[PDB]
Structures are given as structure tokens and as C-alpha cells.
Amino acid sequence: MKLKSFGVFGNPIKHSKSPLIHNACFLTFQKELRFLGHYHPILLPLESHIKSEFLHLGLSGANVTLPFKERAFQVCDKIKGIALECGAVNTLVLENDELVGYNTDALGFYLSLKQKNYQNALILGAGGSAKALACELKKQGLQVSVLNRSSRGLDFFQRLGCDCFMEPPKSAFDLIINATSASLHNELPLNKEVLKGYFKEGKLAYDLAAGFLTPFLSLAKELKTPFQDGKDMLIYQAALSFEKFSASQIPYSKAFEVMRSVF
Ligand SMILES: O=C(O)C1=C[C@@H](O)[C@@H](O)[C@H](O)C1
Numbered sequence: 001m002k003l004k005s006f007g008v009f010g011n012p013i014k015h016s017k018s019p020l021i022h023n024a025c026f027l028t029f030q031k032e033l034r035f036l037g038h039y040h041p042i043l044l045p046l047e048s049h050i051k052s053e054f055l056h057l058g059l060s061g062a063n064v065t066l067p068f069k070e071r072a073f074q075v076c077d078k079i080k081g082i083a084l085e086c087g088a089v090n091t092l093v094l095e096n097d098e099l100v101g102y103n104t105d106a107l108g109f110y111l112s113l114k115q116k117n118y119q120n121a122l123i124l125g126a127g128g129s130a131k132a133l134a135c136e137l138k139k140q141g142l143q144v145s146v147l148n149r150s151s152r153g154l155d156f157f158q159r160l161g162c163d164c165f166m167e168p169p170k171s172a173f174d175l176i177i178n179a180t181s182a183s184l185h186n187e188l189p190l191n192k193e194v195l196k197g198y199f200k201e202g203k204l205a206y207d208l209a210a211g212f213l214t215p216f217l218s219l220a221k222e223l224k225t226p227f228q229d230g231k232d233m234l235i236y237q238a239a240l241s242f243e244k245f246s247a248s249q250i251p252y253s254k255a256f257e258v259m260r261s262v263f
Helices: 018-033 050-057 069-075 105-112 128-139 154-159 192-201 215-222 231-245 252-262
Strands: 003-010 036-043 061-064 091-095 098-102 120-124 143-147 163-165 175-178 204-207
Touching: 003 018, 003 050, 018 036, 018 231, 018 252, 050 069, 050 091, 050 098, 061 231, 069 098, 069 128, 091 231, 105 128, 105 231, 120 128, 128 143, 128 154, 128 175, 154 163, 175 192, 192 215, 204 215, 231 252
Parallel strands: 003 036, 003 061, 120 143, 120 175, 143 163, 175 204
Antiparallel strands: 061 091, 091 098
């Protein structure tokens, strides 16, 4: 039996549901693939190096979560696909001995969104997830505003044509997107009354954290604002990553059916 190794790098990382859904696919598709993948959570120290670790472990591919997506973009050997315009990599593959980066978050997010004609969006956060979502919503022709805590992240969002604010714009937004790490600290990403003001006019409150009711989502729910957590996105982007891990032999829709059900 040929064995290939995979994992997800993050910090923190023990709560990730990738290993479950990817290992289910490796099992299911092992015959088509002619190898058995095995996928593990990898707590990467902040001060380690994603490329060095990838090579040291002998992986054939990896996912990349918080706080590593921008770094992964900087350290990859080659960047392919929409990753180029996201400034973020969530998917690594060893191709012809080169470490190649992809980003499956953009199109995962897109596929998670039922409603096709929101007009504008406010994105909170400036990590790799925020970057991919801005890239993706701009491509769809929404007006995108971005609010974060400092001037870090600015040049990226401005070159994409996003309106970057340094105080909360006093404007209604269709989509309110929490792409901060706040739900992890069990916190709001923004002042409560400010959030309330958005929620009262908004049409969807969208949090990236999956499975659990974050303070961001619980505020939206209390205000009767429609809300959505990261669970459909996580599944779509996993399936797209799997399609890369398979060398484009297993189409993401085949993976998505297995992953959804196991999830
Ligand atoms: O929690 C997880 O395992 C993941 C979260 C997202 O950021 C994805 O970009 C990542 O590839 C997998």
C-alpha cells in the first residue's frame, strides 16, 4: 500500500474538523487515487517555518489555517490560481518537488453563499481569510468595505479596490462578515452598540468559525438578523483542497458529497 502524508497547520489547531473529512475522502477514494492519504492536525509553533516543517514531515500536501495563511503565501515556491490575488494560501501541494500554494477559501466562501445579489459587504479582519473574502466579493461586483484595528493589511485591500475605513462607517451593509480571530477569544469583533447598528439594517451576519454559536452570531440571532456560521464554507473549501491533493483527479463535487455527509 502506497502512503501519502497530509495535514493542517495552525495555532491553535486541536478543534479542526479537516482531518475527519479529508480522511473520510482518502478512504473512500483510495482505489481511484492509487494511494492512501492520511491527514493529521499539526500544531505549528508561531516561530517555526511552514515550508521547513512541510519538507521536514515529508507531506504531499497540507492545509493552512490561522494565523499562517499570509505567511504561507510569502514562503511558497510557486503560487497558482486565485491565491495570486488573495495574498493568502490555505492549501499546499508538493508538485515536482516544489511547494505550491493554492487558495480554496475564496471559492469555498462563494459556494457557501445562497443569495447571489447582496449589494455591499463589510469585512472585519485583516488575516488570510479576510483577504480571500474581499478578493472574492470584489470579483462578484459588490462594494466592499473593510474595517480593522490598525493599518496592517491596508495596501492589500486598497489595491483590490476595497474601501478601507479606520472608524466604523455609518452606512447599512447587506453582508456583515466576521473574519477576525475574536470568536476564538470568545469575544465580539467590534463594539456591541456599533454591531447592533449594522445588524439592524443588515441582511446576513456571516461568521467564519464553524459548528459553534459565536458571540457575533449570538448577537445577530438576538437582533433577528439572519446569520450563517463557517460550516458550509469549511466543507466546500475542504472539498476543493481535496481536488488539489488528488492532483485534480477527484473533482471537488465528488469529495463534497462524502465530506458533507460525514460532517
Ligand atoms: O479549521 C480548519 O481546518 C480550516 C479552516 C480554514 O481556515 C481553511 O482555510 C483551512 O484550510 C482548514
